[PDB]
Amino acid sequence: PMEEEEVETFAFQAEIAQLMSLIINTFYSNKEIFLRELISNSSDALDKIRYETLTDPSKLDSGKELHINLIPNKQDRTLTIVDTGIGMTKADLINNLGTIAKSGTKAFMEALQAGADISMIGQFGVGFYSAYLVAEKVTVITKHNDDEQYAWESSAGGSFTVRTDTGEPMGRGTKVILHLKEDQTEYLEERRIKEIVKKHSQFIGYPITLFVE
Ligand SMILES: COC1=C2C[C@@H](C)C[C@H](OC)[C@H](O)[C@@H](C)/C=C(\C)[C@H](OC(N)=O)[C@@H](OC)/C=C\C=C(/C)C(=O)NC(=CC1=O)C2=O
């Protein structure tokens, strides 16, 4: 019996939009670093719920396990990075994932225009956007203890949407789904994923698991 769902479309802040276009339209040779950025983000999120629980144990009612799961899907061509971290509220998503200017955006673009390696992205605080080196579309599903589950999404192009997620409920955390570009499918390969995690994400302070098939 026909479901009615609310959607809200937002405009990326000007420089974030320019950064996304720079990332998508320019050739870079070390694109694999996108995973290190996403895993670092998940690690950051896990630290936050970890410390918050020390002060309030009920914060783990939504789930005690603190870990990261990597899920490649060769059928629909998606690579999903999941964490049981702190998660983000609707306000968190809208504010921190597009709408508000970030201080390192310009500096990073300057660096890139000068020939800096993309690997540098994390030092500028805009590392999430490196997802667009390999994905044509990114969906961020998230659940924070203080809000309902939400889905953010963008195929770049200057806008992003936010809507309540009606997919599989998550206890708490964030799930980044990368809809990979046709020539970036190597990241759906178990050997390649293991290779890059070993190379760049060896000191993650939480267990990571790769689910194959
Ligand atoms: C201070 O921390 C970081 C910030 C500032 C700000 C966004 C923090 C955020 O505020 C709501 C939460 O406190 C934090 C726990 C959530 C994450 C890191 C999310 O990752 C997962 N898995 O939760 C990430 O994924 C969509 C969201 C935004 C990341 C952006 C825009 C980025 O490019 N760089 C950043 C890396 C950071 O470490 C960044 O901006």
CATH of residue 155's domain is 3.30.565.10
Percentage helix, strand, coil, to 5, in the chain?
45, 25, 35
106 is in an annotated binding site: no
Enumerate the H helices of the chain as residue ranges.
14-25, 33-55, 90-94, 105-114, 190-200
**Ligand 1 contact, 188 CB (< 6 A):** no
Q: Are 88 and 44 in contact (CB under 8 A)?
A: no
Ligand 1 atom closest to Cα of 48?
A: 15
In the three-class reduction of DSSP (H, G, I as helix; E, B as strand; rest coil), residue 15 is classed as helix
Q: With the C-alpha atoms ordered 26, 30, 35, 39, is the resulting torsion angle positive or negative?
A: negative
Q: Give me the helix-helix angle, 14-25 and 105-114, nearest 10°.
A: 30
Distance CA 174, CA 151 (A): 10
Q: Residue 182 has which token pair? A: 């046709």
* 152 CB near ligand 1 (under 6 Å): no
Q: How far apart are the first and last CA of the chain?
A: 34
> How many folded domains does the chain comprise?
1
Tell me the Ramachandran region of residue 78: left when phi exceeds 0, alpha when psi lies from -120 to 50, beta otherwise: beta
User: What DSSP letter does each residue of 144-161 carry, written as one string?
Assistant: -TTS--EEEEE-STTEEE
Contact partners, residue 165, CB within 8 Å, separation at least 6? 141, 149, 150, 151
By most ligand atoms within 8 Å of CB, the mutation choice from 41, 43, 86, 90 for ligand 1 is 41
Q: Is the CB of 84 under 6 A from ligand 1?
A: no
Helix (H) or strand (E) holding 62: none
Domain range for 103: 1-213
List C-alpha distances in Å: 4 to 1, 120, 147, 156, 166.
Answer: 10, 43, 20, 26, 11
Output the residue whose Cα is nearest ligand 1's atom 29.
128
- The closest of 164, 131, 172, 206 to 4, measured between CA atoms, is 164
